[PDB]
Design a protein around this ligand. Structure first.
Ligand SMILES: Cc1ncc(COP(=O)(O)O)c(CN)c1O
Ligand SMILES: Cc1ncc(COP(=O)(O)O)c(CN)c1O
Ligand SMILES: [Br-]
Ligand SMILES: [Br-]
Ligand SMILES: [Br-]
Ligand SMILES: [Br-]
Ligand SMILES: [Br-]
Lengths: 418, 418
C-alpha cells in the first residue's frame, strides 16, 4: 500500500464510519444519526422538486460561483436584520458546500504553516484535522462541568478563564467558537462572548463563529452573535448551514458572512476547491428563506418553531436518561444531549477497545446488548484530554416521538421499571 | 497586510469568476461558459424531483461520506465493463463535488512540497493553482498545431515527445492528462497514450486522467482510457463528471476511480474538506446511470446520442467561423472549439499599447460591443507560454440551433457579408 497522502493526518478515526457500520450490523434504536428521522418542511422539499422540473433550462446548469444570486440576496436580507448591518450579498457572503466547506475555506484561507488556532473541547469533528492540514498548530481548551447543585445544564459547562487567557499570545491567528455548541448544546452568554471578544481584540486574532444551530436555542436563553460585539465585525467570520436551518442535512449547502477583506481569502480557496455549488438546491433554499422572510416574527416561522418542537423531545430524553441512572446535561440549544453514565463501567459488561476509551466501549456495548445507539464524546477531544469525555455519551433527540418512547422502554426494561 | 504563504497567492479571480460576471452584466449571447442552452435528459430531472418528493426521510439527509451507495454501485457497474475489470464500489471509487473537487482531492492527496507535476498546455485552468496550493512544482509542455494555416483538426495539435520525456525526472510525482481535451477537443490516440504511459512506468509517476468529456467523441475517433493500458491501472486515477455525462452542470457531482491504494489519499482529503455530497442529487444520478445501463448499446442511450447531437452543431460553427475569416480547429470530441482570429494577425488595423494579451481584450470587446461571448485561451497557459494562446478564442457550441444561427448572424453583420 501507499502511506501518507503527503504528511497528512489521515483522520480515518472518523467516528461516523465506525458507528454507521455498527448500526447497520445490529439495527438498534439509533440515537446517533445527527439528523431528523422524519420529514423536513414540505415547502422546502417542494421547492427542490420545482427546481428540478423548472421550465428554465438554466435552473440545472452552472450558477454564479461565490453563490447563487437568489440565495445570496435572501441570506443578506436575513442576516442584515440579525446583525443590524447591511451585508453586501456579493462581497460579504459566500455559499459553500455545507458549513463544512465554509470551515475548510476559512481555515485554509486564514491559517498558515505555523499559525496557532485555539480550539474549544469537545470540538466538532473537523476542527483539528483542518487546522493541521493548513499547517496550523491547534491549541486546546476543554469546557468542563460544575458538579454541584443537583440538576445540570449546558450553562454549567465552562472554560477556565485564566487558562484561556494564557493560551492567547501574539502567535494566535484564530479562535474557533461553536455557539450553540455541538454536542453540549451550550449557548454562550454575553459575558462568555465578551471574554473571547476581548482576547481577540487584545491579540489581533480572527474569530470564527460556527453558528449552525443558531435557530435552535430553547426559549429561556437567546442566541447572540459575536460579530455584533464592539470591534468584532472586522475580525469575525460566521458560518451557518441550510442543512441545519431547514433540517435538510443531505442538501449540504452552507455559508460564511463577514467583511469583504476576510471573505476574500475564503474566495480564493473556494474557487479552486469546488468552484461552485449545486444550482437547484441553492434555488430551493433561496425560496425557503424568502418564505420565512415574509413571516419572520410569526410563531409559524420555522426559525421560531423548531425550538418548541425539539424542547419537548429534549425534556423527554432528559427524563428517561435520569431515570436509568445517567446524569444528563440539559442543552440550552440544539438537538444533542450529553449524559454521564455511571452504570456498569468497565466491568463484566465492558470488554472491547479496552485499551481505547470507555465511552467507545459503553456505546458499542449498549448497541449490541440493549439495542440503543449513542456516540462517544471522547472522539471530540484531543488525545491528552480524552479522559474528560470517557464518562459521557452523546444522544440526538431529533427523532419521531414513537422512537423516543421505544428508547425509553428499552432503558426501562433494561433498568427495571420501578 | 499579513501573508498566506499556503501558496494561495494571486489568482484574485479565476477566468470564470470574472467572465461569469461579464455575462451577468452585459447579458450577451453566452458562448463562453460551457453548458447547454436547453433542457437535459428528462429521466434525470424527473429523478431529482422524485428524490425531493421521496417518502423515505433518509433521501434528503446525510449519506455515506465517500459516496451514496446507490451511485457508487452504478458507477462501479458502468466503469467495470468499460475498464474491463471489476472495480470495488466501496474502496476504488470516490464521489465528489464535481470533477472539480475530484481533481482537488487527487492533487492535494498526492502532491507534497517539492513534488513536480507535469501539465500539458493549454490546460483546464484549475490544474496549476491546485498543484501550487499543494506545494507542488508544475512543469508545462504546450500542444502546438502541425504547421497549420486555417481549418485543421485537433489531431494536428501535438506535443514534442523529446520535450515531454525531458520533463520526466526523479522529482516527477504526477502528470495530468485531459482527454477529450478542454479547450482543443483533442482525443489522444493509442500511440499518444502509450507515450505518456511508458514514461509513467519508467519514472514511477501517477497519471491523473481527466475524462469528463469521455462520452462526446465524434466519429471516426474513439475515447481510450489510459487506465486500461498494460500496467497503468495500478498508477492511474480517472475522473468523470455527472454535469458533463448527463448535461446537468448545475448538479456538481463527479467521481474518481482507481486502485484502492491511490484512492485512500483522496478519501482523506475529501473527508476533511466537505465530508459528503448532496444526497438527492446523487440518488438522481444513480437512477440516471441505472437507466442508461439497460440500453448501453442503443442509439437512444444518451452516452451514445450526445456526440451525434453535437456533431452537427460542431460542423455548423466551424463553417461560420471560417466564413467570417477565423481559422478554427475542428475538435475530435467535446463541445468546445478554438479558432485563430485574424483581424490584426497580419493587418496593422489594430494595435493595443495597453499590452495585456489580446485574446482577453478581443474577447471582452465582443461581449460588450457585439453581444457575443467567447473566452480567451491564454487563461489556459502558464505565464511564460500565454502568448501561445493570444491569437485564439474558445467558443461553446452546445446550444440550441436558433442561438447558433444567432451567433453566425451577429458575426456576418459584424464583418460584412455583402
Ligand atoms: C458545529 C457544526 N459545524 C458544522 C457542521 C456542518 O454543516 P454542513 O452539514 O452544512 O456541512 C455541523 C453538522 N452537523 C456541525 O454540527
Ligand atoms: C477539463 C475539465 N475538467 C473538470 C471540469 C469541472 O467539472 P465539474 O463541473 O464536474 O466540477 C471541467 C468543467 N467545465 C472541465 O472542462
Ligand atoms: Br409546509
Ligand atoms: Br423553546
Ligand atoms: Br434565539
Ligand atoms: Br458522432
Ligand atoms: Br496494473
Amino acid at each position: 500500500k501507499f502511506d501518507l497522502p503527503k504528511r497528512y493526518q489521515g483522520s480515518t478515526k472518523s467516528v461516523w464510519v465506525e458507528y454507521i457500520q455498527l448500526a447497520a450490523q445490529y439495527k438498534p434504536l439509533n440515537l446517533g444519526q445527527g439528523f431528523p428521522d422524519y420529514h423536513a418542511p414540505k415547502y422546502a422539499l417542494n421547492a427542490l422538486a420545482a427546481a428540478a422540473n423548472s421550465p428554465d433550462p438554466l435552473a440545472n446548469q452552472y450558477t454564479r460561483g461565490f453563490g447563487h444570486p437568489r440565495l445570496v440576496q435572501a441570506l443578506s436580507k436575513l442576516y442584515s436584520q440579525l446583525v443590524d448591518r447591511t451585508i453586501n450579498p456579493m462581497t460579504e457572503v459566500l455559499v459553500t458546500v455545507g458549513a463544512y466547506e465554509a470551515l475548510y475555506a476559512t481555515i485554509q484561507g486564514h491559517v498558515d504553516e505555523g499559525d496557532e488556532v485555539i480550539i474549544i473541547e469537545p470540538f466538532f469533528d473537523c476542527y483539528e484535522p483542518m487546522v493541521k492540514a493548513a499547517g496550523g498548530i491547534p491549541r486546546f481548551i476543554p469546557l468542563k462541568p460544575n458538579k454541584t447543585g443537583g440538576t445540570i445544564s449546558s450553562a454549567d459547562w465552562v472554560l477556565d478563564n485564566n487558562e484561556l487567557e494564557a493560551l492567547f499570545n501574539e502567535k494566535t491567528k484564530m479562535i474557533i467558537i461553536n455557539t450553540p455548541h455541538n454536542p453540549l448544546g451550550k449557548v454562550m452568554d454575553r459575558a462568555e462572548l465578551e471574554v473571547v471578544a476581548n482576547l481577540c481584540k487584545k491579540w489581533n486574532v480572527l474569530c470564527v463563529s460556527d453558528e449552525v444551530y443558531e435557530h435552535m436555542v430553547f426559549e429561556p436563553f437567546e442566541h447572540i452573535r459575536i460579530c455584533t460585539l464592539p470591534g468584532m465585525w472586522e475580525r469575525t467570520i460566521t458560518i451557518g448551514s441550510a442543512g441545519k436551518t431547514f433540517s435538510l442535512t443531505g442538501w449540504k449547502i452552507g455559508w460564511a458572512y463577514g467583511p469583504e477583506a476576510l471573505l476574500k481569502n475564503l474566495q480564493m480557496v473556494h474557487q479552486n476547491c469546488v468552484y461552485t455549488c449545486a444550482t437547484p438546491i441553492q434555488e430551493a433554499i433561496a425560496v425557503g428563506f424568502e418564505t420565512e422572510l415574509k413571516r419572520l416574527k410569526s410563531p409559524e416561522c420555522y426559525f421560531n418553531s423548531i425550538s418548541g418542537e425539539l424542547m419537548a423531545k429534549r425534556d423527554y430524553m432528559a427524563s428517561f436518561l435520569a431515570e436509568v441512572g445517567m446524569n444528563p446535561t440539559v442543552p440550552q440549544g440544539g438537538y444533542f444531549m450529553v449524559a454521564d453514565w455511571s452504570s456498569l463501567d468497565s466491568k463484566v459488561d465492558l470488554t472491547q477497545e479496552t485499551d481505547a476509551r470507555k465511552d467507545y466501549r459503553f456505546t458499542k456495548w449498549m448497541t449490541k446488548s440493549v439495542g440503543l445507539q449513542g456516540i462517544p464524546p471522547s472522539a471530540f477531544y484531543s488525545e491528552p484530554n480524552k479522559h474528560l469525555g470517557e464518562d459521557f455519551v452523546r444522544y440526538c433527540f431529533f427523532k419521531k416521538d414513537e422512537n423516543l418512547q421505544k428508547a425509553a422502554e428499552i432503558l426501562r426494561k433494561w433498568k427495571g421499571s420501578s
